[PDB]
Paper text:
KIF14 belongs to the kinesin-3 family of motor proteins. Here we report the near-atomic resolution structures of twenty KIF14-microtubule complexes corresponding to five distinct KIF14 constructs in four nucleotide conditions mimicking four key steps of the ATP hydrolysis cycle.
Construct K755 includes the neck-linker and part of the first coiled coil heptad repeat of the CC1 domain. The other four datasets correspond to KIF14 dimers forming a two-heads-bound intermediate with each of the two heads in a distinct conformation (MT-K755-ANP, MT-K755-AAF, MT-K772-ANP, and MT-K772-AAF). This density can be well-fitted with the undocked neck-linker of a motor domain positioned further toward the microtubule plus end (leading head) and part of the coiled coil domain connecting with a docked neck-linker of a motor domain positioned more toward the microtubule minus end (trailing head). The neck-linkers connecting density and the combined densities in the motor domain in the helically averaged cryo-EM maps strongly suggests that the KIF14 dimer in the AMP-PNP and ADP-AlFx states binds to the microtubule in a two-heads-bound configuration with leading and trailing heads in distinct conformations. The new maps with separated densities identify the leading head with the undocked backward pointing neck-linker as the one in the open conformation and the trailing head with a docked neck-linker as the one in the closed conformation. In the case of the MT-K755-AAF and MT-K772-AAF maps, there are also ADP-associated densities in both leading and trailing heads but AlFx-associated densities only in the trailing head. Construct K755 does not include the full CC1 domain but includes part of the first heptad repeat.
Numbering used by the authors:
A (entry chain E): 1 to 441
B (entry chain N): 391 to 755
C (entry chain I): 1 to 429
């Protein structure tokens, strides 16, 4: 059977993970105590789907997850919260010191002393599987942990496991909003390392969702307990085809093939169209077309990057609920007719489609409404080169004076590693340009 | 102005490398050192002030020991005999050919002995009994930002290397409290001091070599020149002094490709910090020479603090980097090429020298 | 478990620390007997940060008290919260320093420092994971400036990879409280610059202007001024004790705040501060906190940042808030007041949020800024310094205790260089 390991690293990972397993438990009928009263009421069924939850003989269902912070605060919310009786107590809080938003701290100094435990519990989880399909790493650029520890880990797994899909779900740093001075360095450092080991890194920025919740959900002052519920849904659609029935099922090695033309341009975006409040759940039809067109609106992207400044290479559309295929085909044609959406000449197909019959579920206490159908888009565009350039210019402005560097050297980093990582992102800026040049003869 | 002469020595292939047939990655086109990875991907190009192509003895521009000396060091001697200060830094990884360039062997001698003997020869030529000279030298090290004396008789016990401290004299600038100084008249009485110091200099076995350098080293030669005026009034009062500093620097050493812990880690961090501050100083001095006045962070390291008066004002500074051309050490050579550089390094792609079998565009033309 | 050591030296540190432990204890629900009488369970999970435990569910603070006169200590003992401290940590001699930095550094303090370190080496080894140190002292005097910087040098050699956070009341511009004030401060800055990682510069005249304008206090005493400093001390390290959305610590702030190793003198502040009558007329929101934070009239440093540029600042929040409000508001400052910020640091702001506010306030905010306007404090002292040293006004009381004139000139240059290093970034090309 199909089995995936969800890893959450740092604070941006955990607070997302707490929202995900909140949702995974509801879709499958699991209480926070790991129990499933419906199955003993039913007498059958594998709704306790062994993709995300392992099962013991006593009826308790235990999630396939490991998450670690290198500080004990955020996990300790889980070891004393409402989901304590769900998880395995082997959660890593060997975080007596934090990474101080330093790569050099999550990659070396405190980058070790914690990793041998992490690889062991994973190896235990993998030894309980009848077949793996890949990993799901939830982290954040900008920190030391989500940047450094994520890189060291991705290096080791590429040795022990090798050819297994590794899908990252990371918080991309925003152009204006930012909660740290040294974000540009930490992003360029792990981006250099994770490039040769990852397979597809799904980008999200916190600045776009602030506007989505404003314009669509009509929330005027949201916090991270809202941004992380939407991110919980993007993942469910990706991993829905491994749990529930469907017409056109999509495995995890299918994103790796259709959305990654060349091995270094595996940075796609994401979004979720029918993000509406309960009130606006009326007054609208929410058909396949109205939902599918919204995914191509530049204002409904979960990353701050205008795709109209670039060209599309590949787009995977994952539908859920009461959806009929002809409605998808009619809609995808309407998009290729519109001229503001330019595709590369070397990809005349462009689109992938996936359809499922299990609609999304409503986390109670939430802001999203109940719908019959829901859509998740994943796109690879040349516009994101603009965002790589913003980081490189911030890098150069404050590296020309060697600012904040003595905090990284103080941990074991060399002065040259900054250059070695700035040159690889100047080659990436060209590869995104070379791809976008239409061919000639 | 006071510019900084950066130079590079490309060592030739050794016997081990020729037997293993280690291929060449560092090439020259005259005014450029180029690095072409065996994958034929991003090709790096560096433009320095002086390039020393010691690669093959029959290539044009072959950089002999005498060539290197006359190119870099002798102007520092001519400057010292004017009443100004000079500093020569030596940087390189282990096995790159740094000691060959600075000291030399029993034969093919290097900058240290060449400079010393030429200095003494010019002193002899300028001796008159109207003009007199006096030479006094010292030799010390820097280890985890602590100063140690290398010319002190020490026994064997725990924590014996007593640390000295830096102090700032209002006129003469910074100096070391308690550092010894010894008078000299030739090179045969320098060699026995240097051989005493280089045995007390800190070393430790690591993944690069079983005897690597883990502390910065400073050899300072202080010249005093006395003159007398014929007015029957200035009795041996015209004094002018100069300082020649020769600084052996330790390598960066990445702690990623060398799993270490404890004292070696601390040593690496300290060395790294020192090198970073030195780079900031040299770049700021270059900007100062090019006109834009700036602030030199001398005070962020013992080395720069002690060498303050020898890297500023009316002075001369040279930095000799040493790099190996083998493909077995891309990361270190590129690290040493990216370090020693004041201008901007350029990168391109140049696998298209195989357009059509030695292009042969002669036909097209 | 992150842990902090508190060292209180002089009459200013102890009279501040006595409110500090009276502010942290009232948070974690500890009463003067060391016993717990709280309501919430989050008060105990991270009690190990500042307090150690005792036998009968009693809690003894990890405080170390230092002085050269017993008057300070008897006030703490015969006081509100004196029965909680460890009596074996009340270290003191007699015959104070006479406002002589020499006496506290070389002559008298050296006969007492070895007893102080015996306590520090004891408390630290009793901890699981030490995060840093915490010193409250004063410049302008002998003990705080001499004994403090002496303990800094010794602890730094023993624990160089830990933080050394130092709260220090700097000398005021208009009216002094000692005559040899610049002699003692310049020699302290020579030690703090090289050895500390973050120091928070406080000026009493700034605190008087706060009590008069904002709080409308007519007769403020020293028990009130320190009731403001205790707030800043508590806000900085709150994210080590209580949970939150975007957490932080002492080291995360030092990284973002210290671009170069020497520029770690900060301009602190605290919100929301108001009068007892005008509390009914103010809406307590995140923007109303930000406008108060970045106001020149709520800085405790007595230096106008509008005469300089911010290299990098920090803003620690506490309460149930929304993270869009924080990011949007701290952005609006950089875009509006673009000239008071550095061009080669794109986002000059660090942010942190905790979910547990103060005893009776829905929210609060703590501010840390590193600005070039601290240039004026050191430039001012040097003019006072050379005006005295040029004629040796009082230099014979310092040389008589084992010091030279050369040591006075070192402290002046290192101060004047730092003055320039800050000025190097008040200029654009
Ligand atoms: C109904 C009401 O508004 O009561 C407030 C109050 O009137 C005001 C004036 C309080 C009051 O402030 C003062 O009276 C004061 C006097 C001198 C110096 C500084 C403050 C208050 O004392 C302050 C006190 O706040 C706290 O207790 C915090 O926990 C504070 N700790 C202590 O005050 C404290 C000290 C010793 C023993 C027990 C508690 C604190 C500050 C920072 C971090 C942690 C805790 C509170 C609610 C008030 C009073 C009591 C009037 C304010 O104080 C602070 C720093 O929050 C001033 O603005 C706030 C809130 C109000 O405006
Ligand atoms: N979407 C989202 N982002 C978060 C959340 N928490 C933190 N972040 C992001 O994380 C970024 C900073 O990196 P951190 O996640 O704090 O780094 P870290 O993994 O915690 O590593 P340390 O800082 O050493 O603890 C900020 O830009 C935030 O936007 C969250 O709950 N949701
Ligand atoms: N904020 C504050 N500052 C104080 C207090 N008491 C003394 N000071 C400051 O401390 C300085 C006196 O130095 P001090 O250390 O007490 O002298 P010492 O006792 O001989 O070491 C003065 O400049 C005061 O500004 C106080 O209660 N609060
Ligand atoms: N110009 C040169 N010609 C030939 N060999 C050289 C030259 N320069 C250096 N070498 C070789 O380099 C070696 C010195 O390397 P080593 O001293 O171990 O490195 P380091 O100088 O960094 O300590 C010598 O054995 C010598 O054969
Ligand atoms: Mg964190």
């Amino acid at each position: 059977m199909r089995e995936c390991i969800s890893i959450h690293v740092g604070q941006a990972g955990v607070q997302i993970g707490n929202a995900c397993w909140e949702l995974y438990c509801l879709e499958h009928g699991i209480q926070p105590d790991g129990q499933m009263p419906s199955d003993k009421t039913i007498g059958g069924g594998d709704d306790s789907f062994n993709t995300f939850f392992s099962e013991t003989g006593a009826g308790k269902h235990v999630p396939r997850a490991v998450f670690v912070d290198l500080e004990p605060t955020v996990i300790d919310e889980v070891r004393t919260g409402t989901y304590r009786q769900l998880f395995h107590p082997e959660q890593l809080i060997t975080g007596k010191e934090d990474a101080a938003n330093n790569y050099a701290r999550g990659h070396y100094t405190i980058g070790k002393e914690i990793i041998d435990l992490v690889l062991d519990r994973i190896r235990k989880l993998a030894d309980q599987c009848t077949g793996l399909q890949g990993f799901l790493v939830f982290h954040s650029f900008g920190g030391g942990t989500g940047s450094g520890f994520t890189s060291l880990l991705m290096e080791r797994l590429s040795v022990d496991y090798g050819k297994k899909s590794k899908l990252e779900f990371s918080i991309y740093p925003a152009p204006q909003v930012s909660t740290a001075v040294v974000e540009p360095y930490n992003s360029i450092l792990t981006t250099h390392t994770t490039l040769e080991h990852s397979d597809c890194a799904f980008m999200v920025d916190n600045e776009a969702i602030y506007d989505i919740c404003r314009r669509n959900l009509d929330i005027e002052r949201p916090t991270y307990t809202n941004l992380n519920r939407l991110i919980s849904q993007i993942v469910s659609s990706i991993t829905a085809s491994l749990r529930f029935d469907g017409a056109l099922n999509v495995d995890l090695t299918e994103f790796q093939t259709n959305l990654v033309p060349y091995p270094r341009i595996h940075f796609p975006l994401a979004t979720y169209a029918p993000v509406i409040s309960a009130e606006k759940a009326y007054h609208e039809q929410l058909s396949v077309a109205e939902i599918t067109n919204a995914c191509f609106e530049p204002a409904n992207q979960m990353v701050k990057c205008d795709p109209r400044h670039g060209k599309y290479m590949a787009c995977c559309l994952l539908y859920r609920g009461d959806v009929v295929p002809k409605d998808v085909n009619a809609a995808i044609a309407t998009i290729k007719t519109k001229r503001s959406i330019q595709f590369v000449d070397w990809c005349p197909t462009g689109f992938k489609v996936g359809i499922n019959y299990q609609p999304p579920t409503v986390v109670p206490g939430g802001d999203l409404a109940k719908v019959q159908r829901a859509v998740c888009m994943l796109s690879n565009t040349t516009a994101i080169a603009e965002a790589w350039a913003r980081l490189d210019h911030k890098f150069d402005l404050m590296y020309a004076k060697r600012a904040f560097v003595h905090w990284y050297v103080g941990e074991g980093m060399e002065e040259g590693e900054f250059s070695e990582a700035r040159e690889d992102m100047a080659a990436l800026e060209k590869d995104y340009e070379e791809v976008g040049v239409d061919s000639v003869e | 102005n006071s510019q900084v002469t950066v130079a590079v020595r490309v060592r030739p292939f050794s016997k081990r490398e020729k037997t293993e047939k280690a291929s060449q990655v560092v090439f020259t086109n005259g005014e450029e050192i180029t690095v072409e990875h065996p994958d034929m991907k991003q090709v790096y190009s560096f433009i320095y002030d002086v390039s020393f192509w010691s690669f093959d003895e029959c290539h044009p521009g072959y950089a002999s020991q005498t060539t290197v000396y006359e190119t870099l060091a002798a102007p520092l001697l001519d400057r010292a005999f004017e009443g100004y200060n000079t500093c020569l830094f030596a940087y390189g990884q282990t096995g790159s050919g740094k000691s060959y360039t600075m000291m030399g062997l029993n034969e093919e001698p290097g900058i240290i002995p060449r400079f010393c003997e030429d200095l003494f020869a010019q002193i002899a030529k300028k001796q008159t009994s109207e003009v007199s000279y006096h030479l006094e030298m010292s030799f010390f090290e820097v280890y985890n930002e602590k100063i140690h004396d290398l010319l002190v008789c020490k026994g064997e016990n725990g924590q014996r290397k007593q640390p000295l401290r830096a102090r700032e004299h209002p006129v003469s600038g910074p100096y070391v409290e308690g550092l010894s100084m010894n008078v000299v008249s030739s090179y045969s009485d320098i060699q026995s001091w240097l051989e005493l110091g280089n045995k007390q200099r800190a070393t430790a076995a690591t993944g690069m070599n079983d005897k690597s350098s883990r502390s910065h080293s400073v050899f300072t030669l202080v010249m005093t020149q006395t003159k007398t005026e014929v007015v029957e009034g200035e009795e041996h009062d015209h004094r002018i002094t100069s300082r020649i500093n020769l600084v052996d620097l330790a390598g960066s050493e990445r702690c990623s490709t060398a799993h270490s812990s404890g004292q070696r880690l601390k040593e690496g961090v300290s060395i790294n910090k020192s090198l970073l501050t030195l780079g900031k100083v040299i770049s700021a001095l270059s900007e100062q020479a090019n006109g834009k006045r700036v602030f030199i962070p001398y005070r962020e390291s013992t080395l720069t603090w002690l060498l303050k008066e020898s890297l500023g004002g009316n002075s001369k500074t040279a930095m000799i980097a040493t790099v190996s051309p083998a493909a077995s050490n891309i990361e270190e050579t590129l690290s040493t090429l990216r370090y020693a550089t004041q201008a901007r390094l350029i990168v391109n792609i140049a696998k298209v020298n195989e357009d059509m079998n030695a292009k042969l565009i002669r036909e097209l033309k | 478990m992150r842990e902090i050591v508190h060292i209180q030296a002089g009459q200013c540190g102890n009279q501040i620390g006595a409110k500090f432990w009276e502010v942290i204890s009232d948070e974690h629900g500890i009463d003067p007997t060391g016993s717990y009488h709280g309501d919430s369970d989050l008060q105990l999970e991270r009690i190990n940060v500042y307090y150690n435990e005792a036998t009968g569910n009693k809690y003894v603070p990890r405080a170390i008290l230092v002085d050269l006169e017993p008057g300070t200590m008897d006030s703490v003992r015969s006081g509100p919260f004196g029965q909680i401290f460890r009596p074996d940590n009340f270290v003191f001699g007699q015959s104070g320093a006479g406002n002589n930095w020499a006496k506290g550094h070389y002559t008298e303090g050296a006969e007492l420092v070895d007893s102080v370190l015996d306590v520090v080496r004891k408390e630290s080894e009793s901890c699981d994971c030490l995060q840093g140190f915490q010193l409250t002292h004063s410049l302008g005097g002998g003990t705080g400036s001499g004994m403090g910087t002496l303990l800094i040098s010794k602890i730094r050699e023993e624990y160089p990879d830990r933080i050394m956070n130092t709260f220090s009341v700097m000398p005021s511009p208009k009216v002094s409280d000692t005559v040899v004030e610049p002699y003692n401060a310049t020699l302290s800055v020579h030690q703090l610059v090289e050895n500390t990682d973050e120091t928070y510069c406080i000026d009493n005249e700034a605190l008087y202007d706060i009590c008069f304008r904002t709080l409308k206090l007519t007769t403020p005493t020293y028990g009130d001024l320190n009731h403001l400093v205790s707030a800043t001390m508590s806000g900085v390290t709150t994210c080590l004790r209580f949970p939150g959305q975007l957490n932080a610590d002492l080291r995360k702030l030092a990284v973002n705040m210290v671009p170069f190793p020497r520029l770690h003198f900060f301009m602190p502040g605290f919100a929301p501060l108001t009068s007892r009558g005008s509390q009914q007329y103010r809406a307590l929101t995140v923007p109303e906190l930000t406008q108060q934070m970045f106001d020149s009239k709520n800085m405790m440093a007595a230096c106008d940042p509008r005469h300089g540029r911010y290299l990098t600042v920090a803003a620690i929040f506490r309460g149930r808030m929304s993270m869009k409000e924080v990011d949007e508001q701290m952005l609006n400052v950089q875009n509006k007041n673009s000239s008071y910020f550095v061009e080669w640091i794109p986002n000059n702001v660090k942010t942190a949020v905790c979910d547990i506010p103060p005893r009776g306030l829905k929210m609060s905010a703590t501010f840390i800024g590193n600005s070039t306007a601290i240039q004026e404090l050191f430039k001012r002292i040097s003019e006072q310094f050379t005006a005295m040293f040029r004629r040796k006004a009082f230099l014979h009381w310092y040389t008589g205790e084992g010091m030279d004139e050369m040591e006075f000139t070192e402290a002046e240059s290192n101060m004047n260089d730092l003055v320039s290093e800050y000025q190097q970034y008040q200029d654009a090309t």
